[PDB]
Write a structure and sequence with these properties.
278 residues, mainly beta, Jelly Rolls, 2 domains, elongated, binds beta-D-glucopyranose, sugar binding protein, Carbohydrates, Tl-galectin
Length: 278
Amino acid sequence: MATETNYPVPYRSKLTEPFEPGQTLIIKGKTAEDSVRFTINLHNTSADFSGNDVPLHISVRFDEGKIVFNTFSKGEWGKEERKSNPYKKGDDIDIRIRAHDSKFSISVDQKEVKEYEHRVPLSSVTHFSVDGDILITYIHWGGKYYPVPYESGLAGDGLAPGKSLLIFATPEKKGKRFHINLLKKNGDIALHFNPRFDEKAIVRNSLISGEWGNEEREGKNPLEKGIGCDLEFRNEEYAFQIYVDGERFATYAHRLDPHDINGLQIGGDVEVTGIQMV
Ligand SMILES: OC[C@H]1O[C@@H](O)[C@H](O)[C@@H](O)[C@@H]1O
């Protein structure tokens, strides 16, 4: 129990809106040398009753060495479904649950490991909770089905120094490349982020007045086909700080005046599950 001051356990959160197909629930935290198990439940209740139906129960067991799924409804549990637990007592955990119309898709360390068919109505999930030997460090519920190629404007102030655009996506299993453009009203691309698996590199460049700039490579490429990633475009005074999965992958000196970056485009071989401005 280190610097908790965030989401203490047991954690109970009453959903403000229904959990719907296309939306993802992200839970990250830390465990200890003596953690034995922790749970994540998607459940029903009127507001705080706590104890009705549990559409989806997830038990990560360090003693058993697996992650176990099941549901509780009408006063009884069904048959558990198991998957290997890739975590050893002590490491950080990252479990994401995305709702779909026929099931829940669960990924561990951004790796899809389980498809749990709905046994009870998804619409009956009104609450969510986490408990056990885990120190929760991050919880987020949002997203939707983002079609790609994708295009949209950004809030009002857009992406300006001091702001960050976070994108959660998964390069397609058999994809070759995809890109993300941060644009200004006149169509110029301040930042072109273009991972190329065939080239084993991520190209960064700018499009000014219909002309592509220098083209910056350098950098191993921390992305993997079929594995989810967290992309952060941190706009600062002198450059874009590009973070991939928590670590800085590269810096990109501004070639265009920051501010007024109110456009976004995403294309290529990639699935997008979350977009947010912070
Ligand atoms: O115009 C040249 C540019 O074309 C783009 O389609 C490519 O992704 C860039 O790597 C290239 O520098």
